[PDB]
Structure 1
Amino acid sequence: RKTNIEAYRDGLKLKTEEDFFACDRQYVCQNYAPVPVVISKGKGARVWDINGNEYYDFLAGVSSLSQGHCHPRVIAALCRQAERLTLTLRAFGNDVTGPACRFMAEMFGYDRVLLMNTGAEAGESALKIARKWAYEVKEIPPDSAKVILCNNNYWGRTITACSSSTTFDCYNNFGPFTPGFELIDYDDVGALEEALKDPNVAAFFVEPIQGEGGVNVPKPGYLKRAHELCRSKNVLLIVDEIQTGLCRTGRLLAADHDEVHPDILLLGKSLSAGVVPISAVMGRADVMDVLKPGTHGSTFGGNPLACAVAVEALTVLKDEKLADRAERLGAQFRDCLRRELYGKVPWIKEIRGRGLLNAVEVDSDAIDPNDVVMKLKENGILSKPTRGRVMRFIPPLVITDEEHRDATTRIIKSFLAVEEER
């Protein structure tokens, strides 16, 4: 029995990928670049296009699909809960939202969980919490709160996010901007210490590995050292684990690699296994409780459907031991790429990452990075770079041993064929 999208789409008589591309240019706000594929279905680490070609998905929603496409447990949890109750608002109680927050609070070790919808909203929320806490508990002067963040950060596309970006296309022509941000180099403890001299600082807002910035892995101890500096000044450490969290780097949180318990933790993306948007902000009671009744809200935040989904998605990460999976396969991946590609392929600048969050930065003055992207696709690997030159390898963590060996060999083959063609 055809649902409305199916019947409608049928009537458009779209046969080729080009037919779909034309439909984007005509009707879809054109804020994303052209795409090389029209995906129709996904299962685990694999997707298929409209012509039945199979690929490994090496983007995975930039770590939103860690549990794989269409994970049966998560889809069942979705459909069962959807037959019962999807939305009450937080104006009314329900039998799911609190149990879901207790589940998360225990899993991550926080007193209070705020559920929002997108990663941007989690960042907005955290900044609001840190500002209000700074005014109310730190007693900094009215409208003086500052938040330190890093160059090449990414946390979203709200105006306030654009206001704290150093990426030209993120901010250009979108001002005037929200004040109150101090930008410093990533991976630079000395710069953080200098900025922490300002007593009106509320928080330092950081990624454990910069995501959209290029899979920038900081030096050993960066985050550990930053937390001590912040504690010294009674400044909150807000750690954005939207992309790095949830087993992706080989630990439950990327912050775990430094034994850092964030003062405020952000999650999103794979919190729902890519099924529906749900994000979370977690913290100790004497920070989070500054959000009194009426001072924050969201129509869909903490809706029971997304809660049911998230509990199942997080349980899958545990049950399937996906952190161990990510540690093991990712160390193998980087070891194979280094052995077969360094030396042999001179236009590779770096192979880096943790767990299954991996990147290969190329030198865009020695090669066209897009040739690498297209060659990957020809070998069945779908992959989207960041900043042009940073190739990304972010597969679902459920990828099997056999599938990962196959994908690894396809990836190596692609880089070597580009070098041969150069």
Structure 2
Amino acid sequence: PPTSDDIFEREYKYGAHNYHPLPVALERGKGIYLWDVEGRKYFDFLSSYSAVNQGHCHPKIVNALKSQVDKLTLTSRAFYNNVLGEYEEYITKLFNYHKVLPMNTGVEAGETACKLARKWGYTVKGIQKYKAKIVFAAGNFWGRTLSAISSSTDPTSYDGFGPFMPGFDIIPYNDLPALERALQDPNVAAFMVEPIQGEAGVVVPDPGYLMGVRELCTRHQVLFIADEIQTGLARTGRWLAVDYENVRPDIVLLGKALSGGLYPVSAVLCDDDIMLTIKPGEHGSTYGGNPLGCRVAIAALEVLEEENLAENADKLGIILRNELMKLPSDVVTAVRGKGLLNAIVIKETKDWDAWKVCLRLRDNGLLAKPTHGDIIRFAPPLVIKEDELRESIEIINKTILSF
């Protein structure tokens, strides 16, 4: 029966050192709760960066996976499977776009959007071959490929990682005058932006930012790519975070909770005039659109809809933020978020930091992760109930006030 310490040391030996995780070794998860190898129980306040919006191992999603794995799991796209088309019709009708392109990981959805933007740039907009530019916001995080780190302003992402992808320009987040300036160049094909920046520390832009982005993109014939990989699927209290301002992006990226954490599924949504710039043989993925992922994804979306999780995230979010704001201003300097995507900023000294807070939260039965040594994310599954939420808030209060 391996201990928590055994688990840590074994990984140190045989695995890459590309992470420094919070020292907790989990073996079971159900709904809002996680259990470690010692049998200790925890509130999950990370939800695997929104991948388990439905709670850990939601029985509807598990039943879909169990049913389909006995039938067929992977043919490759060399042939048709019977599930993919059913999934495609369902998701396209739900989000109201003509088409979906299926992939596996969030970064793959991002790479696909970049490819679409360029191909649309050259074939429709009329940009001269390989002059196409994509604009990004500072603080952006969309993954770990050579392309994705090329748009990052985080030195931990890019430093040491070889020459960078050309054609990627960076402007400040939440800055309409900067976007307006950037879009004067007719060689800009697109702007990719997160409606709230997750990894940057739940950076919520000013009211009107999303409608301003939509207006500028349309005016200058530029694609608006919304990365809703973390913000989508009910986490902020709507189907999409862009719904708060009734904004329709050209391209929508989804991932994470698209499978309830059971399978790496991601999706790129857009209309025919953009989607069909990519011809047969010009893009894909071995596992993209496989029948098992598709069955899981259908069930995952059905859960979000059936259980009205968006409404729940909105209602409980307000409660969470209001209670967090009662913590002393000397210790917690800001509270931010929408729905159940939230964070606090702590008054870090050399004595005390976000890591130390998260260690004590763990000791008191709640799992959260810091994102810069002063930021702590609070993001439980959307299936959490009010009494469960208030019990969690009591843990958070006990912990913060115990210093």
Question: TM-score, with normalisation over the residues of structure 2?
Answer: 0.98
The AA in structure 1 aligned to 2:321 is: R
Q: What's the counterpart of residue 408 of structure 1? A: 393
TM-fit CA distance, 1:142: 1.1
Paired positions, count: 402
TM-fit CA distance, 1:97: 0.2
CA contact (8 A) 1:74 1:313 kept: yes
Q: What's the counterpart of residue 84 of structure 1? A: 71
Distance 2:253 2:382 in 1: 20
TM-fit CA distance, 1:53: 0.3
Q: Which deviations, in whole Å up to 9, do the C-alpha atoms of 1:211-254 show, x marking residues without a partner?
A: 10110000001011111001001100000000000000000100
**Farther-moved stretch of structure 1 (345-354 vs 179-188):** 345-354
Q: Structure 2 residue aligned with 1:258, among 245, 261, 278?
A: 245
TM-fit CA distance, 1:364: 2.3
Distance 2:15 2:129 in 1: 43
Q: Structure 1 residue aligned with 2:190, among 192, 203, 206?
A: 203
Q: What stretches of structure 1 move > 4 A for 4+ residues in a row?
A: none
TM-fit CA distance, 1:375: 1.8
1:178 and 2:181 matched: no
Distance 1:365 1:139 in 2: 54
**Farther-moved stretch of structure 1 (401-410 vs 213-222):** 401-410
1:99 and 2:78 matched: no
Distance 1:27 1:371 in 2: 27
TM-fit CA distance, 1:345: 4.1
Q: CA RMSD in A?
A: 1.0
TM-fit CA distance, 1:371: 2.1
Distance 1:388 1:107 in 2: 39
Distance 2:260 2:356 in 1: 31
Query: Identity across aligned pairs (percent)?
Result: 51
Q: What's the counterpart of residue 361 of structure 1? A: 345
The AA in structure 2 aligned to 1:402 is: D
Q: What's the counterpart of residue 41 of structure 1? A: 28
Q: What's the counterpart of residue 8 of structure 1? A: none
Q: Which deviations, in whole Å up to 9, do the C-alpha atoms of 1:326-356 show, x marking residues without a partner?
A: 0000101001111x21xx2413221000000
Structure 2 residues without counterparts, runs of 5 or longer: none
Distance 2:313 2:238 in 1: 8
SS in 1 for 2:373: coil
The AA in structure 1 aligned to 2:219 is: S
Distance 2:120 2:21 in 1: 43
Q: What's the counterpart of residue 242 of structure 1? A: 229
Q: Give the 5 Å matches for 1:219-230.
A: 219-230=206-217
Q: Structure 2 residue aligned with 1:142, among 100, 124, 129?
A: 129
Distance 1:387 1:194 in 2: 30
**Farther-moved stretch of structure 1 (82-91 vs 98-107):** 82-91
The AA in structure 2 aligned to 1:307 is: C
Q: What's the counterpart of residue 7 of structure 1? A: none
CA contact (8 A) 1:357 1:394 kept: yes
SS in 2 for 1:104: helix
SS in 2 for 1:187: coil
Q: Structure 2 residue aligned with 1:122, among 109, 116, 125?
A: 109
Structure 1 residues without counterparts, runs of 5 or longer: 1-13
Q: What's the counterpart of residue 355 of structure 2? A: 370
